[PDB]
Enzyme design. Structure first.
Site: not given
Ligand code: AMP
Ligand code: AMP
Lengths: 125, 124
Positions: B7, B10, B12, B41-42, B44-45, B66, B85, B119-121
């Site tokens: 995941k 896919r 990042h 999704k609000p 993503n990088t 964080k 964003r 996870h991308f932080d």
């Molecule tokens: N439902 C959500 N609402 C806001 N931000 C999210 C949500 N899900 C994931 N994120 C953000 O997505 C980024 C990547 O998270 P990840 O999917 O765990 O690699 C992080 O900055 C999270 O804070």
């Protein structure tokens, strides 16, 4: 329910939802989710990352020989995005394990039916 | 089905390009990588480096996540990335994004055997 040969080809060889393998674990995930590792490890398997319409169209393209000497296969004019899933050296049923490889090649398929559509993946070339 | 490591790739990884080629990059990629399937999704990088270089971050500088978790790692080197964003007007399923090119350290959370990003932080 019933599964036709055309549908089995879709399950075993089509993934239209992605432009290419989505991760290095893609083959492990897909070989299991498409039920290709039920009784033994399938050693190799190709997935095609194109629309179903574009792959079905190959059945109207270049008639060629199948790798087993039969003469009822078709080769694509277009070069298609494909993933080849190949068993690793340490793969051992029931713990099958695959390496994900990517390529852009012509495909060769065998076709049947009305509509005339693929039922067999022969090769990439 | 999908593993956490898969995941992450896919969501990042995009080493098919050195940087985002268009301002429309995020709109197209957020959709094609299925990050807008059920909802937008609000943030993503995407990282424009090799998979091996990103996986190696899990052996680099240990830092706090964080939320306070301690399984985050900061890249020793800066990396080419694209920040996506969601805009204030975005409404599912017509999700809309701003694209920003950057070159920054990445911070990822790691897990597993092998120990890899899940996870991308943050970028810094
Ligand atoms: N439902 C959500 N609402 C806001 N931000 C999210 C949500 N899900 C994931 N994120 C953000 O997505 C980024 C990547 O998270 P990840 O999917 O765990 O690699 C992080 O900055 C999270 O804070
Ligand atoms: N038109 C065809 N339909 C089904 N199998 C074929 C066809 N042409 C060749 N084969 C052979 O069928 C085997 C592949 O099995 P399957 O793809 O599961 O149908 C290989 O030995 C192929 O050489």
């Amino acid at each position: 329910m019933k599964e036709t040969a055309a549908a089995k080809f879709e399950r075993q060889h089509m993934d239209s939802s992605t432009s290419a393998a989505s991760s290095s674990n893609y083959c492990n995930q897909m070989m299991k989710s498409r039920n290709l590792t039920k009784d033994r490890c399938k050693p190799v398997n190709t997935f095609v990352h194109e629309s179903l319409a574009d792959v079905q169209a190959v059945c109207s393209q270049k008639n060629v020989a199948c790798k087993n000497g039969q003469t009822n296969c078709y080769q694509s004019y277009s070069t298609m995005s494909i993933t080849d899933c190949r068993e690793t050296g340490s793969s051992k049923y029931p713990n099958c394990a695959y390496k994900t490889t990517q390529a852009n090649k012509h495909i060769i398929v065998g076709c049947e039916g009305n509509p005339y559509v693929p039922v067999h993946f022969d090769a990439s070339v």
